[PDB]
Design an enzyme around this catalytic site. Structure first.
Site, PDB file in Angstrom:
ATOM      1  CB  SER A  61     -66.332  -4.523  32.489  1.00 27.11           C
ATOM      2  OG  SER A  61     -66.179  -3.199  32.036  1.00 27.11           O
ATOM      3  N   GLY A  62     -68.673  -6.830  31.740  1.00 27.42           N
ATOM      4  CA  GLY A  62     -68.713  -8.270  31.499  1.00 27.42           C
ATOM      5  C   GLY A  62     -69.796  -8.998  32.248  1.00 27.42           C
TER       6      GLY A  62
ATOM      7  CG  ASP B  25     -68.026  -5.465  24.758  1.00 31.41           C
ATOM      8  OD1 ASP B  25     -67.073  -6.269  24.773  1.00 31.41           O
ATOM      9  OD2 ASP B  25     -68.166  -4.549  25.622  1.00 31.41           O
TER      10      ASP B  25
ATOM     11  CG  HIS C 272     -64.794  -4.223  27.597  1.00 27.93           C
ATOM     12  ND1 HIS C 272     -66.188  -4.128  27.546  1.00 27.93           N
ATOM     13  CD2 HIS C 272     -64.440  -3.966  28.883  1.00 27.93           C
ATOM     14  CE1 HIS C 272     -66.638  -3.851  28.761  1.00 27.93           C
ATOM     15  NE2 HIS C 272     -65.602  -3.751  29.583  1.00 27.93           N
TER      16      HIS C 272
ATOM     17  N   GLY D 163     -65.551  -1.946  36.378  1.00 33.27           N
ATOM     18  CA  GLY D 163     -65.359  -3.116  37.198  1.00 33.27           C
ATOM     19  C   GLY D 163     -66.590  -4.007  37.196  1.00 33.27           C
TER      20      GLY D 163
HETATM   21  N1  LIG Z   1     -73.111   1.820  32.741  1.00 31.83           N
HETATM   22  C1  LIG Z   1     -72.067   2.564  32.790  1.00 31.83           C
HETATM   23  N2  LIG Z   1     -72.144   3.808  33.097  1.00 31.83           N
HETATM   24  C2  LIG Z   1     -70.736   1.931  32.472  1.00 31.83           C
HETATM   25  C3  LIG Z   1     -70.565   0.582  32.859  1.00 31.83           C
HETATM   26  C4  LIG Z   1     -69.345  -0.057  32.587  1.00 31.83           C
HETATM   27  C5  LIG Z   1     -68.313   0.619  31.947  1.00 31.83           C
HETATM   28  C6  LIG Z   1     -66.976  -0.100  31.656  1.00 31.83           C
HETATM   29  N3  LIG Z   1     -66.708  -0.042  30.239  1.00 31.83           N
HETATM   30  C7  LIG Z   1     -65.706   0.599  29.792  1.00 31.83           C
HETATM   31  O1  LIG Z   1     -64.917   1.276  30.443  1.00 31.83           O
HETATM   32  C8  LIG Z   1     -65.559   0.441  28.300  1.00 31.83           C
HETATM   33  C9  LIG Z   1     -64.348  -0.457  27.971  1.00 31.83           C
HETATM   34  C10 LIG Z   1     -63.584   0.176  26.803  1.00 31.83           C
HETATM   35  C11 LIG Z   1     -63.921   1.689  26.807  1.00 31.83           C
HETATM   36  N4  LIG Z   1     -65.090   1.657  27.673  1.00 31.83           N
HETATM   37  C12 LIG Z   1     -65.786   2.743  27.788  1.00 31.83           C
HETATM   38  O2  LIG Z   1     -66.857   2.755  28.370  1.00 31.83           O
HETATM   39  C13 LIG Z   1     -65.326   4.097  27.248  1.00 31.83           C
HETATM   40  C14 LIG Z   1     -66.345   4.627  26.213  1.00 31.83           C
HETATM   41  C15 LIG Z   1     -66.580   3.702  24.988  1.00 31.83           C
HETATM   42  C16 LIG Z   1     -65.350   3.554  24.070  1.00 31.83           C
HETATM   43  C17 LIG Z   1     -65.638   2.583  22.920  1.00 31.83           C
HETATM   44  C18 LIG Z   1     -66.974   2.707  22.184  1.00 31.83           C
HETATM   45  C19 LIG Z   1     -68.184   3.075  23.044  1.00 31.83           C
HETATM   46  C20 LIG Z   1     -67.810   4.096  24.159  1.00 31.83           C
HETATM   47  C21 LIG Z   1     -68.479   1.953  31.563  1.00 31.83           C
HETATM   48  C22 LIG Z   1     -69.695   2.608  31.826  1.00 31.83           C
END
Ligand SMILES: N=C(N)c1ccc(CNC(=O)[C@@H]2CCCN2C(=O)CCC2CCCCC2)cc1
Ligand SMILES: [Ca+2]
Length: 223
Positions: free
Chosen positions: A177-178, A84, A40, A175
């Site tokens: 993410s990844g 992912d 993502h 942020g």
């Molecule tokens: N550990 C956590 N609480 C956490 C950590 C990182 C992230 C960042 N990820 C994101 O923002 C990701 C990218 C695309 C939609 N997305 C979401 O989390 C929204 C919810 C998703 C939408 C797609 C399928 C599974 C649920 C979100 C949540």
């Protein structure tokens, strides 16, 4: 990272920042030429930033290297975030040193209850927004798959696992993410998704890297 602590400079030497004019995702160095991140996080025009602590200040141990290619998992589904994971190749090999180092791929998966280290430059507040400029760390256990699926019915696949704390307060966030989840010295997870951040009964969801080792190894050998 919500409820974590300041890691300390370069104490997580495999942690990278992906930059496209600004930090937008974490990643993990797996050898001198390749980074693993979330699918993502895909976009064109990526610069990989290695040896980072404060991402807004040049402190002297950074390496900034453009990506030559990106390879999103062939089965990534953006609607469900199943598979992912993506691979990013550096246009030139990183100079590896004690501040810029690779993290080992798993030979096997990790069990529930194993303690891991999660790190990143993402949001630190569970309500609202504050971005740190130094790297933050969180010690978090792998949760049972049943607690994971109970929290997120019909949304968890065998390519995902949950880690964190069901009572809330400590989690990864936007942020981050990844970026890495490291358990027993191996990259076992990638920060993928969750409901809010650090919310009760809403733990974080991570890409299950041990399912992808053969794909990673074959992909880098052929690219
Ligand atoms: N550990 C956590 N609480 C956490 C950590 C990182 C992230 C960042 N990820 C994101 O923002 C990701 C990218 C695309 C939609 N997305 C979401 O989390 C929204 C919810 C998703 C939408 C797609 C399928 C599974 C649920 C979100 C949540
Ligand atoms: Ca810096």
């Amino acid at each position: 990272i919500v409820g974590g602590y300041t890691c300390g400079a370069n104490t997580v030497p495999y942690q990278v920042s992906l930059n496209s004019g600004y930090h937008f995702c974490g990643g993990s160095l797996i050898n001198s030429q390749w980074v693993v991140s979330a699918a993502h996080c895909y976009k064109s025009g990526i610069q990989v930033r290695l040896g980072e602590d404060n991402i807004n200040v040049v402190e002297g141990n950074e390496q900034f290297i453009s990506a030559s290619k990106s390879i999103v998992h062939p089965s990534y589904n953006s609607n469900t975030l199943n598979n992912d994971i993506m691979l990013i190749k550096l246009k030139s090999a990183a100079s590896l040193n004690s501040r810029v180092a690779s993290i080992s791929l798993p030979t096997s998966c990790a069990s529930a209850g194993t303690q891991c280290l999660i790190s990143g430059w993402g949001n630190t507040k569970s309500s609202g927004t504050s971005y740190p400029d130094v790297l933050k760390c969180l010690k978090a256990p792998i949760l049972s798959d049943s607690s994971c699926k109970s929290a997120y019915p019909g949304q968890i696949t065998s390519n995902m696992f949950c880690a964190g704390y069901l009572e809330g307060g400590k989690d990864s966030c936007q942020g981050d993410s990844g970026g890495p989840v490291v358990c027993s010295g191996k990259l076992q997870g990638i920060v993928s998704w969750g409901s809010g951040c650090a919310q009760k009964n809403k733990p974080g969801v991570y890409t299950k890297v041990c399912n992808y080792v053969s794909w990673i190894k074959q992909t880098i050998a052929s690219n």
